[PDB]
Amino acid sequence: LKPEMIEKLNEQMNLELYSSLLYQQMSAWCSYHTFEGAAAFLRRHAQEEMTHMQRLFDYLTDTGNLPRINTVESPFAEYSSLDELFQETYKHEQLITQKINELAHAAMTNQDYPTFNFLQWYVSEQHEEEKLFKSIIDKLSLAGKSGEGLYFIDKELSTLD
Amino acid sequence: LKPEMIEKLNEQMNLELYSSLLYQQMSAWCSYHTFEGAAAFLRRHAQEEMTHMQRLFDYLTDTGNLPRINTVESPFAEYSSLDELFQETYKHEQLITQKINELAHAAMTNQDYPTFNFLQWYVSEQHEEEKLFKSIIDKLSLAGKSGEGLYFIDKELSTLD
Amino acid sequence: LKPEMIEKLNEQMNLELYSSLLYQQMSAWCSYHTFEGAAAFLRRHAQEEMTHMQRLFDYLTDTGNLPRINTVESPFAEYSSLDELFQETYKHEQLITQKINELAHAAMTNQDYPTFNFLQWYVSEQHEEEKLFKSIIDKLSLAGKSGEGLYFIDKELSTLD
Amino acid sequence: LKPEMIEKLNEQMNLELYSSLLYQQMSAWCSYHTFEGAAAFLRRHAQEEMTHMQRLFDYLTDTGNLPRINTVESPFAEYSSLDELFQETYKHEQLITQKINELAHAAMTNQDYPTFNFLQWYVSEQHEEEKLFKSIIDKLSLAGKSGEGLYFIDKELSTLD
Amino acid sequence: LKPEMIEKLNEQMNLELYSSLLYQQMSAWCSYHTFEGAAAFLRRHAQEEMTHMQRLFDYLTDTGNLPRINTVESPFAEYSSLDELFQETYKHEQLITQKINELAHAAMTNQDYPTFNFLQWYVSEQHEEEKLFKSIIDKLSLAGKSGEGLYFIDKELSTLD
Amino acid sequence: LKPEMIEKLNEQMNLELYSSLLYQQMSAWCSYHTFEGAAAFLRRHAQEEMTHMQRLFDYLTDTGNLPRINTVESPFAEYSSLDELFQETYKHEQLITQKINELAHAAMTNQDYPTFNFLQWYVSEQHEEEKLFKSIIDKLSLAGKSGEGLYFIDKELSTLD
Amino acid sequence: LKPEMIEKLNEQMNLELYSSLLYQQMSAWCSYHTFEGAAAFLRRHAQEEMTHMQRLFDYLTDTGNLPRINTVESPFAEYSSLDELFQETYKHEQLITQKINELAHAAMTNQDYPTFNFLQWYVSEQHEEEKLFKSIIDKLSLAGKSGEGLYFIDKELSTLD
Incomplete structure (x- = not known):
């Protein structure tokens, strides 16, 4: 891989990690606000985004590179x-x-x-x-x-997907 | 929950999150250095520490609190x-x-x-x-x-549960 | 068991008994008011609280004590x-x-x-x-x-749990 | 078959074809307007009307005739x-x-x-x-x-039939 | 989607629809001319091309667009x-x-x-x-x-998938 | 298919064929030097490369072209x-x-x-x-x-894949 | 194993290799000429002849000898x-x-x-x-x-042995 692609893939990996935490954080807001259905949907989506992260992490290692997890900003x-x-x-x-x-x-x-x-x-x-x-x-x-x-709607979100 | 308890728990939740990323990062080092077995073992452990994080996250929500994910320092x-x-x-x-x-x-x-x-x-x-x-x-x-x-040993770690 | 603990356990047992009757009484209000779903949920919870009572009753007998059921106030x-x-x-x-x-x-x-x-x-x-x-x-x-x-909501309560 | 009947059957076949496309077109309107349930019902009905078309098409061939698909007007x-x-x-x-x-x-x-x-x-x-x-x-x-x-209602239409 | 893309896709969708009717019409010619095997084969193909049309139809709807079915020339x-x-x-x-x-x-x-x-x-x-x-x-x-x-050959076409 | 592509695809096909015979020849060296595990692995891989060759051969024929097998240099x-x-x-x-x-x-x-x-x-x-x-x-x-x-390692090679 | 037998065995191995490619190439001609059934039959025989080559290759290695794959002339x-x-x-x-x-x-x-x-x-x-x-x-x-x-006949060959 060319340096440019290595770095772009690494940055995307970090973006997916951040996104996972963002959805987790969002679910908390939902629960704190009584939307347990939406909270559950987001939790499920936080886990899904993590998968996206891992797949990128693996691609970088498969190609003989060292994925680097950078500082993560609070999603709060x-x-x-x-x-x-x-x-x-x-x-x-x-x-x-x-x-x-x-x-x-x-x-x-x-x-x-x-x-x-x-x-x-x-x-x-x-x-x-x-x-x-x-x-x-x-x-x-x-x-x-x-x-x-x-x-x-909240009821719907609880099983949506 | 007492305000002091809320803070300590939230801190612990963040430490586990960091700890999960730390192990994910260590596995990368292992892959790069040719220790696929150790890499697979730490990856499994990264996932486990993540469950420790979630358990705390939920406890905070179950108790009517709003867990807060803070900035995460790079584990690199x-x-x-x-x-x-x-x-x-x-x-x-x-x-x-x-x-x-x-x-x-x-x-x-x-x-x-x-x-x-x-x-x-x-x-x-x-x-x-x-x-x-x-x-x-x-x-x-x-x-x-x-x-x-x-x-x-690396061979052993590969399957060590 | 020390006398203090025997009595505290006995009092808790009586509190659980009272609570069971309170929920049963409450379910009647629900039914009389057309909330058959809420009535059913409370009935189920009256039975559950009774279980809590029995477990305490058993602990007292296991330890060689005599559980005592006291006067029960009307939960009406x-x-x-x-x-x-x-x-x-x-x-x-x-x-x-x-x-x-x-x-x-x-x-x-x-x-x-x-x-x-x-x-x-x-x-x-x-x-x-x-x-x-x-x-x-x-x-x-x-x-x-x-x-x-x-x-x-009433419909929900009918199966809640 | 008499010429009159051959032509009337052929025209009906074309009407059924047009109707199938009309319902398909209608489903698009539903989707574009957020009624995914109604859209699904209409799609299913577009397929059904097509069946009606085929049955007529087959009757014409069985009787030794040549079904003719005419110009179709836009159902938009x-x-x-x-x-x-x-x-x-x-x-x-x-x-x-x-x-x-x-x-x-x-x-x-x-x-x-x-x-x-x-x-x-x-x-x-x-x-x-x-x-x-x-x-x-x-x-x-x-x-x-x-x-x-x-x-x-939209929810109903999604399974209606 | 870029307006230009929308137009090309819509055009393709219409071409497939036409193509499906063209094959349905060709099978009729086959039946009339005594080639039941070739007729059955083209009919199957008419149905398949129809699925190609639907796939495009859906893509347009999934992307928040309104697919438009235009006038269809006779394939006769x-x-x-x-x-x-x-x-x-x-x-x-x-x-x-x-x-x-x-x-x-x-x-x-x-x-x-x-x-x-x-x-x-x-x-x-x-x-x-x-x-x-x-x-x-x-x-x-x-x-x-x-x-x-x-x-x-006609015998062959009958079952040719 | 354009002329340039045909030629390029034909060259790749011959490259795969050579690659196959090369791995075949290599396993012999392994066998001769006592590495039965490595030999086994390479024999399997010669077969695999051969499948890559076949797939290209087919593509060329499907597209109405005549794949041409050229002289193959000794991989020894x-x-x-x-x-x-x-x-x-x-x-x-x-x-x-x-x-x-x-x-x-x-x-x-x-x-x-x-x-x-x-x-x-x-x-x-x-x-x-x-x-x-x-x-x-x-x-x-x-x-x-x-x-x-x-x-x-040799032992590990015998069953790898 | 006497050197003369080794040379003769090695010669046969290469002959079988060439034979396999010859049938592969012949199958291409068949394809190019519309004889898909004959082509398939010849494809199957190229594979078969390849196994005749492998059997010879293995005997030579089992006997502590080094099989040698020589240049293969184009079978075109x-x-x-x-x-x-x-x-x-x-x-x-x-x-x-x-x-x-x-x-x-x-x-x-x-x-x-x-x-x-x-x-x-x-x-x-x-x-x-x-x-x-x-x-x-x-x-x-x-x-x-x-x-x-x-x-x-072509239809027959499509399945022959």
């Missing part, structure tokens, strides 16, 4: 509502998608076919994730003005 | 050998054990019987952990001290 | 709403928790390790119960302004 | 709401029913007993379809003023 | 023989392959990695399709060229 | 040691990967998306091969300084 | 027809049988009973092969003079 933040919380998760999922595309673009420019091939898994996964997170925001749109609505 | 470091690496892991396990004891002591003083009860799981696990890592350092001192031996 | 009371009813159950569950902690504190001061050990079961159980009863109050908060909300 | 249209969308599907299902009756009437006048016999399947199927599509409009009537209502 | 045409018919199908398959390549090229240029990834399924399938239809034209040139042979 | 060579041998195999695996990348680049440049898609299987496989062969070299460096060490 | 050639191609395969198989007899004869004269014993498998196999290839030519002469016949 305050949210005004469950809608705002989920809107941010959606915005975040999009940043991840952009980072993957820039990674794929760099792989292609550097003629690194093996890494481009490795990234395909992420490209497919992100398409699915964005769809999923969009729906949630949409549902919140349909029935999110009321606690009974909130109560119902 | 250099090691002169496999022996020095495992020496550091044993010492780090001993630190965790000590922190658990201080928390148990604080729970007792504060007559917080529910938290003290909750901690007993960690006390027992810590006992098992220390013994395990001690055995590893022992084998290294014995069979190790010379290449060929490292091959067999 | 009138409630303004289902929310008030559940708020009282939550307050009651908390009193029970406090009584257990005072019991554990007395056991520790009297160096009665066997009884402290026996109480651990209760300490764990109460942590679970408080959590459970908190959630209900929380749900009532999310969707409890409407009969449709009430109708939905 | 804009709808103001989900209620309007379903009202149109109901009106459309009715047109199909009328076309089948005119087909049965022509078969009878032409003393084409074999085709009248063949149409019986469609006559029965349409009775079922109209009923089904009426209910949906009815349900939309009961609980379709609110997003929570919409949210609930 | 005359053929001088079974050989000429299958020659036309092979050529039509080659056209589809070309269109897929142009779309893949557009996705690359536009750095649309998710769409390019999505198209790989079509690229592979197209490879299988072309080979299949090529084999058919081969057999026809060989065994065909004379009645009796047509009986056996 | 002398090796100083077992590790010298494996170093060679590693270098060779690397060359194959480079050639596969050049082929993927050529496909890109020629907008041959079908061929690019086809090559993806090789790209992923090579990633696995390099990892594997790299591991062997590492194991050899850790415990290959003694007859006893070589003895264990 | 032109064939005017399927008939001529198969006629060449038969002649080639005959050539093989003859070289096996000479080897058996050489083993006898040199009182090399172990090798004579080992060769018996080849003797038995060759008898089978010849019979097989002979039948193919026979069938071709019976029905092979019409594309209809060719088509039928």
